[PDB]
Write an enzyme that holds these catalytic residues in place. Structure first.
Site, PDB file in Angstrom:
ATOM      1  N   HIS A 143      42.405  44.207  40.167  1.00 41.53           N
ATOM      2  CA  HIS A 143      41.536  43.062  40.429  1.00 41.53           C
ATOM      3  C   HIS A 143      41.873  41.899  39.516  1.00 41.53           C
ATOM      4  O   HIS A 143      40.989  41.206  39.006  1.00 41.53           O
ATOM      5  CB  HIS A 143      40.071  43.461  40.282  1.00 41.53           C
ATOM      6  CG  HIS A 143      39.620  44.494  41.270  1.00 41.53           C
ATOM      7  ND1 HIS A 143      38.327  44.975  41.296  1.00 41.53           N
ATOM      8  CD2 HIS A 143      40.272  45.121  42.280  1.00 41.53           C
ATOM      9  CE1 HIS A 143      38.210  45.872  42.260  1.00 41.53           C
ATOM     10  NE2 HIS A 143      39.375  45.978  42.873  1.00 41.53           N
ATOM     11  N   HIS A 163      34.209  44.245  43.050  1.00 40.36           N
ATOM     12  CA  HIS A 163      35.231  44.336  44.090  1.00 40.36           C
ATOM     13  C   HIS A 163      35.297  42.956  44.734  1.00 40.36           C
ATOM     14  O   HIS A 163      34.436  42.605  45.556  1.00 40.36           O
ATOM     15  CB  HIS A 163      34.895  45.434  45.097  1.00 40.36           C
ATOM     16  CG  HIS A 163      35.018  46.814  44.529  1.00 40.36           C
ATOM     17  ND1 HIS A 163      34.008  47.414  43.806  1.00 40.36           N
ATOM     18  CD2 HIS A 163      36.052  47.688  44.535  1.00 40.36           C
ATOM     19  CE1 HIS A 163      34.408  48.611  43.411  1.00 40.36           C
ATOM     20  NE2 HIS A 163      35.644  48.803  43.838  1.00 40.36           N
TER      21      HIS A 163
HETATM   22  C1  FAD Z   1      45.923  48.249  45.594  1.00 40.82           C
HETATM   23  C2  FAD Z   1      44.755  47.295  45.554  1.00 40.82           C
HETATM   24  C3  FAD Z   1      43.497  47.711  45.910  1.00 40.82           C
HETATM   25  C4  FAD Z   1      42.397  46.835  45.912  1.00 40.82           C
HETATM   26  N1  FAD Z   1      41.197  47.282  46.375  1.00 40.82           N
HETATM   27  C5  FAD Z   1      40.220  46.428  46.446  1.00 40.82           C
HETATM   28  C6  FAD Z   1      38.991  46.833  47.022  1.00 40.82           C
HETATM   29  O1  FAD Z   1      38.840  47.917  47.500  1.00 40.82           O
HETATM   30  N2  FAD Z   1      38.011  45.889  47.155  1.00 40.82           N
HETATM   31  C7  FAD Z   1      38.134  44.641  46.645  1.00 40.82           C
HETATM   32  O2  FAD Z   1      37.164  43.912  46.722  1.00 40.82           O
HETATM   33  N3  FAD Z   1      39.258  44.244  46.036  1.00 40.82           N
HETATM   34  C8  FAD Z   1      40.272  45.076  45.971  1.00 40.82           C
HETATM   35  N4  FAD Z   1      41.470  44.672  45.444  1.00 40.82           N
HETATM   36  C9  FAD Z   1      41.595  43.295  44.942  1.00 40.82           C
HETATM   37  C10 FAD Z   1      41.539  42.234  46.010  1.00 40.82           C
HETATM   38  O3  FAD Z   1      42.034  42.756  47.195  1.00 40.82           O
HETATM   39  C11 FAD Z   1      42.376  41.045  45.517  1.00 40.82           C
HETATM   40  O4  FAD Z   1      41.951  40.603  44.277  1.00 40.82           O
HETATM   41  C12 FAD Z   1      42.397  39.848  46.468  1.00 40.82           C
HETATM   42  O5  FAD Z   1      42.720  40.352  47.752  1.00 40.82           O
HETATM   43  C13 FAD Z   1      43.376  38.767  46.063  1.00 40.82           C
HETATM   44  O6  FAD Z   1      43.383  37.703  47.045  1.00 40.82           O
HETATM   45  P1  FAD Z   1      44.371  36.463  46.918  1.00 40.82           P
HETATM   46  O7  FAD Z   1      44.176  35.577  48.076  1.00 40.82           O
HETATM   47  O8  FAD Z   1      44.225  35.930  45.569  1.00 40.82           O
HETATM   48  O9  FAD Z   1      45.778  37.162  47.038  1.00 40.82           O
HETATM   49  P2  FAD Z   1      46.558  37.837  48.219  1.00 40.82           P
HETATM   50  O10 FAD Z   1      45.601  38.399  49.157  1.00 40.82           O
HETATM   51  O11 FAD Z   1      47.557  38.723  47.627  1.00 40.82           O
HETATM   52  O12 FAD Z   1      47.308  36.648  48.951  1.00 40.82           O
HETATM   53  C14 FAD Z   1      48.452  35.971  48.438  1.00 40.82           C
HETATM   54  C15 FAD Z   1      49.485  35.855  49.530  1.00 40.82           C
HETATM   55  O13 FAD Z   1      50.508  34.886  49.207  1.00 40.82           O
HETATM   56  C16 FAD Z   1      51.759  35.358  49.617  1.00 40.82           C
HETATM   57  N5  FAD Z   1      52.737  34.660  48.835  1.00 40.82           N
HETATM   58  C17 FAD Z   1      52.910  34.731  47.500  1.00 40.82           C
HETATM   59  N6  FAD Z   1      53.806  33.912  47.034  1.00 40.82           N
HETATM   60  C18 FAD Z   1      54.253  33.243  48.153  1.00 40.82           C
HETATM   61  C19 FAD Z   1      55.218  32.240  48.339  1.00 40.82           C
HETATM   62  N7  FAD Z   1      55.909  31.696  47.353  1.00 40.82           N
HETATM   63  N8  FAD Z   1      55.420  31.809  49.599  1.00 40.82           N
HETATM   64  C20 FAD Z   1      54.716  32.350  50.581  1.00 40.82           C
HETATM   65  N9  FAD Z   1      53.781  33.282  50.520  1.00 40.82           N
HETATM   66  C21 FAD Z   1      53.595  33.694  49.271  1.00 40.82           C
HETATM   67  C22 FAD Z   1      51.674  36.865  49.424  1.00 40.82           C
HETATM   68  O14 FAD Z   1      52.619  37.593  50.153  1.00 40.82           O
HETATM   69  C23 FAD Z   1      50.228  37.158  49.838  1.00 40.82           C
HETATM   70  O15 FAD Z   1      50.115  37.488  51.206  1.00 40.82           O
HETATM   71  C24 FAD Z   1      42.572  45.520  45.454  1.00 40.82           C
HETATM   72  C25 FAD Z   1      43.843  45.137  45.017  1.00 40.82           C
HETATM   73  C26 FAD Z   1      44.927  45.972  45.127  1.00 40.82           C
HETATM   74  C27 FAD Z   1      46.289  45.491  44.696  1.00 40.82           C
HETATM   75  O1  HBX Z   2      37.345  50.865  43.370  1.00 37.26           O
HETATM   76  C1  HBX Z   2      38.270  51.149  44.047  1.00 37.26           C
HETATM   77  C2  HBX Z   2      39.292  52.135  43.680  1.00 37.26           C
HETATM   78  C3  HBX Z   2      40.077  52.742  44.645  1.00 37.26           C
HETATM   79  C4  HBX Z   2      41.035  53.664  44.276  1.00 37.26           C
HETATM   80  C5  HBX Z   2      41.225  53.972  42.957  1.00 37.26           C
HETATM   81  C6  HBX Z   2      40.469  53.355  41.996  1.00 37.26           C
HETATM   82  C7  HBX Z   2      39.493  52.457  42.351  1.00 37.26           C
END
Ligand code: FAD
Ligand code: HBX
Ligand code: NAG
Ligand code: NAG
Ligand code: NAG
Ligand code: NAG
Ligand code: NAG
Ligand code: NAG
Ligand code: NAG
EC number: 4.1.2.10
Length: 517
Positions: free
Chosen positions: A458, A496
């Site tokens: 996160h 989350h």
């Molecule tokens: C494994 C995992 C599990 C998670 N589980 C949860 C959960 O259960 N619930 C929850 O609330 N949160 C969860 N999170 C966190 C949450 O999903 C993220 O914090 C959030 O989605 C981030 O959103 P964002 O828009 O900042 O980034 P992103 O959704 O990553 O969007 C950024 C996008 O930009 C693109 N990009 C990057 N650089 C470039 C570029 N130069 N040119 C073009 N495109 C580019 C990437 O490919 C990507 O698609 C999780 C995170 C991970 C990694």
């Molecule tokens: O809170 C979400 C989560 C999911 C898998 C592993 C650890 C945490």
């Protein structure tokens, strides 16, 4: 207040009718808005702007139909187990702290690979920021997201066990089913539906106007272009064959960076927006000096124990949350594996489970420790930047982990968890553990917290409101350039954050449209 939630349904790929390969040069030209990053915030932002204006959304990854295990709850581990070949939806990295981690590389962003947990922001978050939020519109916007992709989860045996344990351990009150981040134990929403189908930010593209919205995939945005009043005017992006392309905004339109905590500071730095002496030392011409681009980058610690029950438990997705002000707790139950899901454990040399196990987890709020994103290449956006989080450099974070680990000890001592011990002895050494068990002097808990930390995934920061951005998410000193994604805040909105950043994409889109009208 829950009449509006989504139903069980197939993943809606209708939007593919306006998704194109970035090799198509006819996408080059002028638009009203260019959104960089088709992720959690970027997709609802682009869809919202397209209600009235011509929008180009640029995403470096491909479409999720290419990786079918991103589309089911059962496939969560698969995408993390899959090797990173530069094209997969999961991009692997290791922070400079030595902690394994991942980010998304796919249309839909991290909502296509994440654990599905859905929550609205802690209602105190808005006033903490000092931003003059339109709170009624925030709530309407949550409902707009939730109507498309959020369900009330069905019962899962392990999630119910852990919820009974949280309550018995004193994480009160019982909040029942609620989307709100409040102290106590609750069932929250999920972006996996009750048939296991994953729903995600890409489906919010279906709310865009198909006459106004264009999406280019495998579009690697390399540089933001500026006027020769300093203004952003467009972008350079390369396609999967390596050829270059240019697109521009026109009139009163804008470029918005939505490339995530890692991608947004990287692209700003590559484009000459960032610390003057740092960019000068790389011979990157400074377009806009700002000492905070890539600074104040945060990763909330995850700490955990793993128990191996003597009888099989059912795998689950996380839906039941135990919330206090100083720690946020959940548990995942999982099948065994011989290939680890990368970054579930902080290193690749972690012991492998041979039977079903419960991963029992606590999250540090904030956190107060922070680090930075810096460039590894001064030219190539496909080379991942360096990232360091400085886990537990701030003693308050460590103290909060100690409190959470003690509460995990309480949880293991509940009647609820007793049937999952291997030995019917009085203490918690009756559980079988995968990895390091809990140690009860504060010094042993501090060591446990420091040694066994992992990423909660996160992470946030790097382009903070109040440092790089104003309260309308504009890059200070530059016209027609905004940032909307998790790089914008220094603390979590809740346990989350995907629900907050889904909302934020549309919310800022509406603010842009209102400002312009
Ligand atoms: C494994 C995992 C599990 C998670 N589980 C949860 C959960 O259960 N619930 C929850 O609330 N949160 C969860 N999170 C966190 C949450 O999903 C993220 O914090 C959030 O989605 C981030 O959103 P964002 O828009 O900042 O980034 P992103 O959704 O990553 O969007 C950024 C996008 O930009 C693109 N990009 C990057 N650089 C470039 C570029 N130069 N040119 C073009 N495109 C580019 C990437 O490919 C990507 O698609 C999780 C995170 C991970 C990694
Ligand atoms: O809170 C979400 C989560 C999911 C898998 C592993 C650890 C945490
Ligand atoms: C779900 O379907 C029911 C009736 O079948 C209805 O109440 C509701 O409009 C639907 N929800 C969504 C989000 O379409
Ligand atoms: C785009 O086209 C190239 C060939 O020009 C191909 O290799 C690539 O797979 C295509 N990408 C998508 C997302 O269709
Ligand atoms: C927004 O919804 C929350 C529940 O998520 C509620 O507590 C709050 O009162 C609502 N705020 C406004 C301004 O309607
Ligand atoms: C930057 O360019 C100057 C020449 O103008 C050179 O002396 C210096 O070593 C360069 N530094 C880097 C990091 O390329
Ligand atoms: C909600 O946010 C407020 C303001 O930052 C904080 O004081 C409070 O502890 C938070 N509550 C929970 C349950 O996290
Ligand atoms: C690039 O990243 C690698 C891998 O972490 C690291 O060893 C190297 O020092 C980095 N190089 C630069 C110039 O940042
Ligand atoms: C820890 O964070 C708090 C809040 O930002 C700050 O006041 C304190 O100085 C920090 N501690 C250290 C050692 O930097």
């Amino acid at each position: 207040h829950h009449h509006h939630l989504a139903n069980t349904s197939a993943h809606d790929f209708s939007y593919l009718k306006f998704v194109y390969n970035a090799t198509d040069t006819s996408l080059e030209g002028s638009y009203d808005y260019i959104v960089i990053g088709g992720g959690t915030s970027g997709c609802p932002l682009a869809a919202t702007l397209s209600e009235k204006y011509k929008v180009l959304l640029l995403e470096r990854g491909t479409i999720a139909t290419e990786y079918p295990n991103t589309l089911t709850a059962d496939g969560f581990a698969y995408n993390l187990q899959q090797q990173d070949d530069g094209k997969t939806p999961v991009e692997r990295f290791v922070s400079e702290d030595g902690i394994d981690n991942v980010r998304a590389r796919i249309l839909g962003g991290t909502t296509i690979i994440n654990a599905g947990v859905y929550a609205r922001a802690n209602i105190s978050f808005y006033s903490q920021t000092g931003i003059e939020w339109d709170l009624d519109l925030v709530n309407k916007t949550y409902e707009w997201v939730e109507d498309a992709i959020v369900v009330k989860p069905n019962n899962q045996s392990w999630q119910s066990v852990i919820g009974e344990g949280f309550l018995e351990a004193g994480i009160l009150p019982d909040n029942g089913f609620s989307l709100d981040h409040e102290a106590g134990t609750r069932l929250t929403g999920s972006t996996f539906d009750n048939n296991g189908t994953r729903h995600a930010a890409d489906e919010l593209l279906n709310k865009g106007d198909p006459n106004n919205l264009l999406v280019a995939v495998q579009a690697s945005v390399e540089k933001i272009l500026f006027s020769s009043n300093l203004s952003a005017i467009g972008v350079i992006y390369t396609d999967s064959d390596g050829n270059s392309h240019q697109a521009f905004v026109r009139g009163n339109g804008e470029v918005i960076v939505s490339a995530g905590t890692i991608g947004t500071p990287q692209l700003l730095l590559l484009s000459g927006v960032g610390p003057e002496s740092y960019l000068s030392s790389l011979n990157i011409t400074v377009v806009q000096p700002n000492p905070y681009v890539g600074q104040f980058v945060y990763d909330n610690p995850r700490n955990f124990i793993n128990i191996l029950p003597p009888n099989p438990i059912e795998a689950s997705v996380v839906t039941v949350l135990g919330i206090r002000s100083d720690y946020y707790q959940v548990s995942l139950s999982s099948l065994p594996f011989s290939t680890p899901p990368f970054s579930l454990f902080p290193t690749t040399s972690y012991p492998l489970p041979n039977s079903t196990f419960a991963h029992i987890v606590s999250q540090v709020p904030g956190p107060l420790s922070h680090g930075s994103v810096t460039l590894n290449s001064s030219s190539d956006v496909r080379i991942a930047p360096n990232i360091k989080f400085n886990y537990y450099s701030n003693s308050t974070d460590l103290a909060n982990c100690v409190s959470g680990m003690k509460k995990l000890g309480d949880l293991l001592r509940t009647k609820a968890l007793e049937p999952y011990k291997a030995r019917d002895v009085l203490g918690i050494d009756g559980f079988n553990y995968l990895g390091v068990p809990l140690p009860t002097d504060d010094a042993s808990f501090e060591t446990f917290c420091l040694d066994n930390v992992a990423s909660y995934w996160h992470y946030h920061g790097g382009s903070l409101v109040g440092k790089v951005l104003d309260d309308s998410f504009r890059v200070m000193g530059i016209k027609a350039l905004r940032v909307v994604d998790a790089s914008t805040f220094p603390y979590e909105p809740n346990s989350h954050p995907q629900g907050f950043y889904l909302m934020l994409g549309r919310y800022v889109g509406l603010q842009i449209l209102q400002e312009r009208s």
